[PDB]
């Protein structure tokens, strides 16, 4: 709930270099494959019975861009993650019923995916700073119980 100085500068000196499109499907395509009891919420997404398809569906494609577009709303407004994902705290609870663990799981997919897109320029401290940012955007949603 506190943000040390170098953290803010670091989650952004690496944010603005994210291709919200390309790392968009990537976080989602990975989460449908490596955690496939999750495909259950995306049955309205079309054919998802193969990596080739889970990588390749248009619906999954442009839901990703949206999901990661939701992390830019964490980055810019680093003191008020409460207010930002408060409406998404509901929709990821009362509407769908997505167990907290799942968030924390997409969270890691995401911390893996830039650790691949940014190589050596994504350092342990930087990782210390994002896997933390995960755990809070992750928690903002985890509220409609608490």
């Amino acid at each position: 709930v506190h943000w040390s100085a170098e953290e803010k500068q670091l989650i952004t000196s690496i944010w603005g270099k994210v291709n919200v499109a390309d790392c968009g499907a990537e976080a989602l395509a990975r989460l449908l494959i490596v955690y496939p009891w999750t495909q259950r919420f995306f049955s309205s997404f079309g054919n998802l019975s193969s990596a080739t398809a889970i990588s390749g569906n248009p619906n999954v494609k442009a839901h990703g861009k949206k999901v990661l577009t939701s992390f830019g709303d964490a980055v810019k407004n680093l003191d008020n993650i409460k207010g930002t994902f408060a409406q998404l705290s509901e929709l990821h609870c009362d509407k769908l019923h997505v167990d907290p663990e799942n968030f924390r799981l997409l969270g890691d997919i995401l911390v893996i995916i830039l650790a691949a897109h940014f190589g050596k320029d994504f350092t342990p401290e930087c990782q210390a700073a994002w896997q933390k940012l995960v755990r809070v955007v992750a928690h903002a949603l985890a509220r409609k119980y608490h």
Binding site: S55, G119, P124
Partner: protein, 141 residues
């Protein structure tokens, strides 16, 4: 469970990452103590300061049992017989502390070896490290 392609993608990757261990197994523990200080409670005997001969060197040990654990992809319980006791009865390592290490291991491979770790490979690798620890917790679960 691991099927052939699991067991084989988990080979493919370990046939490349054969190169580096005190260079790769060692970078996932610096990632562990930094992202999760808490796990520093298990090492009062250790120096954890950026660079030391302990995280380099115990680092080099952790890759091995994961490399060894890969060479015996069918019988890993026995292939990590000592370790599962020294971690589950003696040191008594909290279950979750594995997923974090396991996940720490994925990062370092995502760091250095991007275009191997494709989504499917990610899955396999996950199922693997995620069952490496299972066989390390064996004694308690």
């Amino acid at each position: 469970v691991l099927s052939a392609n699991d067991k084989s993608n988990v080979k493919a990757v370990f046939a490349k990452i054969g190169g580096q261990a005190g260079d790769l197994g060692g970078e996932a523990l610096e990632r562990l103590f930094i992202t999760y200080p808490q796990t520093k409670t298990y090492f009062p005997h250790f120096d954890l300061s950026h660079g030391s001969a302990q995280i380099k060197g115990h680092g080099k040990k952790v890759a091995e049992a994961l490399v060894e654990a890969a060479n015996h992809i069918d019988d890993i319980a026995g292939a990590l017989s000592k370790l599962s006791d020294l971690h589950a009865q003696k040191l008594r390592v909290d279950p979750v502390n594995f997923k974090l290490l396991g996940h720490c291991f994925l990062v370092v491979v995502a760091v250095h070896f991007p275009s191997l770790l494709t989504p499917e490979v990610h899955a396999s690798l996950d199922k693997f490290v995620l069952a490496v620890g299972t066989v390390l917790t064996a004694k308690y679960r």
